[PDB]
Design a protein around this ligand. Structure first.
Ligand code: HEM
Ligand SMILES: C[C@]12CCC(=O)C=C1CC[C@@H]1[C@@H]2CC[C@]2(C)C(c3cccnc3)=CC[C@@H]12
Length: 466
């Protein structure tokens, strides 16, 4: 009896479980590096820190490309910007000038710590109004970080109640929802197989994004002066002015680079904040030790600062642990081989897609003690006095040419937001008793389901107000 002709084979079902965990579970059968082919495309998935550090860092330049996808073309205005732009002159110039802009907040009256705390102060005033009520804190945080990144990009902020904030939220959500059905890695290209309206819907939200930032740019060409460079749009048009490189710095190149910075600065930081609160609702013991730590190292005399990370070490460890258990990009952003090369002595051809399964690195049982569990302690020494790097299999912000350029801002935003909130607010399960689901929702970012938290002004903070 004969065996059937096989014209197709996939190791696991499409749309069943998170794909970063489906690739991870496949390592027990096929090892830490394997490939999948779909038509002409071959994709390599890497799930061990050694091979990952080879792709990102040792041969970083060889694998610094980004694959072309119809959906990412639209959000990037055909691969301009930074994150979805391929390797080459465009990407390298704008990333540098984007990273050069962050240097401008070293110290002064426009210090990054001072810009963060200015918006956090308004945030906590708005949250204090909800004393005794259960709310979704997504939007208040969204406003806070949106103003920070808009200050870094334009030296402008939005006043309370500005409708543009709700317009931005609407398109942010619309773009994320249509950029990918689940994570960016789609095994099967469903979008070109059946009639859908995903590209059309995505174009609609991106047009609103582009139109909104185009108007801002135009208005700013009258305000720009070469003698004053204080934000990222100043930095980039300074470059355009100076090259008089020119093709690289058109208005749509400048707009798209801002769009990447605007989008990343809001959606990542807002997301990690919600994740941390969700974990603290699930672990009151860890939550209480954070209250005890901050009362003993900062008290209520003053508000937190960036220097307090030297003594708020359980807080810094808690943030580290969320970025491990629930990485913002559990499979980073897809990489591509820019030239013929090798991974683990295995051949990888030019143009091949390469994906680092950061989820596999952060949940490897040989590199981590009980990787399923939430344990900020793992990042602290046994006496709780010094922070440690317990594992070399940890790259929350990537590494190499494609590493994250907003890491510094992110770690400051995350540390200061949770410090100010823990100082001032009790953060408890709502009256219904529902705890947030920690399963997550994989999109281009690893999001959490909306949830509510009962927020109360702490008594110890009040009593210090006399
Ligand atoms: C917890 C906060 C954040 C995390 C965990 C995070 C993590 C990452 C990771 C893992 C990557 C990709 C690495 C790779 O593709 O190989 C990335 C890319 C990037 N991140 Fe972040 N990020 C965060 C916040 C931010 C912020 C606030 C910005 C502000 C601009 C930012 C800007 C970027 C950009 C521009 C890229 C693309 C880099 C490139 O393609 O060259 N990120 N992020
Ligand atoms: C999709 C996105 C959000 C919605 C929006 O309205 C505008 C866009 C375009 C720019 C996108 C952004 C989301 C995050 C992106 C993908 C990314 C990233 C990913 C994970 C950690 N840090 C950074 C770099 C560029 C960013």
């Amino acid at each position: 009896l004969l065996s059937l002709p096989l014209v197709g084979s996939l190791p696991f079902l499409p749309r069943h479980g998170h794909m970063h965990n489906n690739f991870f579970k496949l390592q027990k059968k096929y090892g830490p590096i394997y490939s999948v082919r779909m038509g002409t495309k071959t994709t390599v998935i890497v799930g061990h820190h050694q091979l990952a550090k080879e792709v990102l860092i040792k041969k970083g330049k060889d694998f610094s490309g980004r694959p072309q996808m119809a959906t990412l073309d639209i959000a990037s205005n055909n691969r301009k910007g930074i994150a979805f732009a391929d390797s080459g002159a465009h990407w390298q110039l704008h990333r540098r000038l984007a990273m050069a802009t962050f240097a401008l907040f070293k110290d002064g009256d426009q210090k990054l710590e001072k810009i963060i705390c200015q918006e956090i102060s308004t945030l906590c005033d708005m949250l204090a109004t909800h004393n005794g009520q259960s709310i979704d804190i997504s939007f208040p945080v969204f406003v806070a970080v949106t103003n920070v990144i808009s200050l870094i990009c334009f030296n402008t902020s939005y006043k309370n109640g500005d409708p543009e904030l709700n317009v931005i939220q609407n398109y942010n959500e619309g773009i994320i929802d249509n950029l990918s059905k689940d994570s960016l890695v789609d095994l099967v290209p469903w979008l070109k197989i059946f009639p859908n309206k995903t590209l059309e819907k995505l174009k609609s939200h991106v047009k609103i994004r582009n139109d909104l930032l185009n108007k801002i740019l135009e208005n700013y060409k009258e305000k720009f002066r070469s003698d004053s460079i204080t934000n990222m749009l100043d930095t980039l048009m300074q470059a355009k002015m100076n090259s008089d490189d020119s093709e690289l710095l058109s208005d749509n190149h400048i707009l798209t680079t801002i769009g990447d910075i605007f989008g990343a600065g809001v959606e990542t930081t807002t997301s990690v904040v919600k994740w941390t609160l969700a974990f603290l609702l699930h672990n009151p013991q860890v939550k209480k030790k954070l209250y005890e730590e901050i009362d003993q190292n900062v008290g209520f005399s003053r508000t937190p600062t960036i220097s307090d990370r030297n003594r708020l070490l359980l807080l810094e460890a808690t943030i580290r642990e969320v970025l491990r258990l629930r990485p913002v990009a559990p499979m980073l952003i897809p990489h591509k081989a820019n030239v013929d090369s090798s991974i683990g002595e295995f051949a990888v051809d030019k143009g091949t897609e390469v994906i680092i399964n950061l989820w596999a690195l952060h949940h490897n049982e040989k590199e981590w003690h009980q990787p399923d569990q939430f344990m900020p302690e793992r990042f602290l020494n046994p006496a709780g006095t010094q922070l440690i790097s317990p594992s070399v299999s940890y790259l929350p912000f990537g590494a190499g040419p494609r590493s994250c350029i907003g890491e510094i801002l992110a770690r400051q935003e995350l540390f200061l937001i949770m410090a100010w909130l823990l100082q001032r607010f009790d953060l408890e399960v709502p009256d219904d008793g529902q705890l947030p689901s920690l399963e997550g929702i994989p999109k281009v970012v690893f999001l959490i389901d909306s949830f509510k938290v009962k927020i109360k002004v702490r008594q110890a903070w009040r009593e210090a107000q006399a």
